[PDB]
Design an enzyme around this catalytic site. Structure first.
Site, PDB file in Angstrom:
ATOM      1  N   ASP A   8      -3.693 -10.462   1.233  1.00  0.00           N
ATOM      2  CA  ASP A   8      -4.494  -9.526   2.001  1.00  0.00           C
ATOM      3  C   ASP A   8      -4.979 -10.306   3.212  1.00  0.00           C
ATOM      4  O   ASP A   8      -5.223 -11.522   3.124  1.00  0.00           O
ATOM      5  CB  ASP A   8      -5.692  -9.040   1.173  1.00  0.00           C
ATOM      6  N   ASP A 127      -1.125   4.558  -7.274  1.00  0.00           N
ATOM      7  CA  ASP A 127      -2.171   3.902  -8.055  1.00  0.00           C
ATOM      8  C   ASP A 127      -2.460   4.703  -9.313  1.00  0.00           C
ATOM      9  O   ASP A 127      -2.681   5.917  -9.247  1.00  0.00           O
ATOM     10  CB  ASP A 127      -3.467   3.796  -7.255  1.00  0.00           C
TER      11      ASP A 127
END
EC number: 5.3.1.16
Length: 241
Positions: A8, A127
């Protein structure tokens, strides 16, 4: 199979937000460019990068790093606030063909076709938790069956996804590949498994499911375990092939 390191980016630095909470953000002392360069050298062909500055703060602070990483763009799938065609076109100009998208697709599924028009492979980030679709803006939706949702999106051109069992990293449990397998086979989509990928057993299992699914399960994404050194690059490489 593919073993995809993931990182990230936040404010130009390698970062990690504990259990998805921004109030609990940490920064790794590792140059993002040198890190990606090392991974390419170690043989990794696909790297998962998420621009949190764009996703969370609608900031372009990570653009300079992404432009420096464009040299390896063919080996990078980028995500993070990709909700418009103008932005997708900009990233594609930089060489990022594989783009991770989610909320925008749920709001406007035609977005998938639009991305293909500019030669982008839209990888949908699915997700789930407990086998149920779990998205921030779709908590009250009537349908939350993963396969059902994907079948609907395939009509719009969806071919590949990242399946993340979102609570694993937090509960310190490993990925449940039975769900990933079911999704891969029933929706007939290419899948990169994520969440709870922090042990050799998980890699060993993924390789088996890779075979049982005749390739639909393309591999896995190693995030926290990679950056925390819980899963060494040596072990990751052993399953990269």
């Amino acid at each position: 199979m593919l073993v995809v390191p993931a990182i990230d980016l936040f404010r130009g630095k390698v970062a990690r937000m504990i259990k998805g909470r921004k109030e609990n953000t940490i920064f790794y002392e590792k140059d993002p460019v040198e890190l990606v360069e090392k991974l390419i050298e170690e043989g990794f062909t696909l790297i998962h990068v998420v621009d949190l500055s764009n996703a969370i703060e609608n900031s372009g602070e990570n653009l300079p790093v992404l432009e420096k990483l464009s040299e390896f763009a063919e080996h990078i799938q980028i995500g993070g606030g990709i909700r418009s065609l103008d932005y997708a076109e900009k990233l594609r100009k930089l060489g990022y063909r594989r783009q991770i998208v989610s909320s925008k697709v749920l709001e406007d599924p035609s977005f998938l076709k639009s991305l293909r028009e500019i030669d982008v492979e839209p990888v949908f980030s699915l997700d789930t938790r407990g086998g149920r679709v779990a998205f921030k803006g779709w908590l009250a939706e009537e349908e939350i069956d993963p396969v059902s949702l994907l079948k609907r999106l395939k009509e719009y051109g969806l071919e590949e996804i990242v399946h993340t069992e979102i609570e694993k990293d937090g509960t310190l449990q490993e990925h449940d590949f039975s769900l990933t397998k079911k999704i891969a086979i029933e929706a007939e989509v290419k899948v990169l498994a994520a969440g709870g990928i922090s042990s050799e057993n998980s890699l060993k299992t993924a390789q088996k499911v890779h075979t049982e699914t005749n390739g639909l399960l393309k591999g896995v994404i190693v995030g926290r375990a990679f950056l925390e050194g819980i899963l060494t690059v040596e072990v990751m490489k052993r399953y990269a092939r």
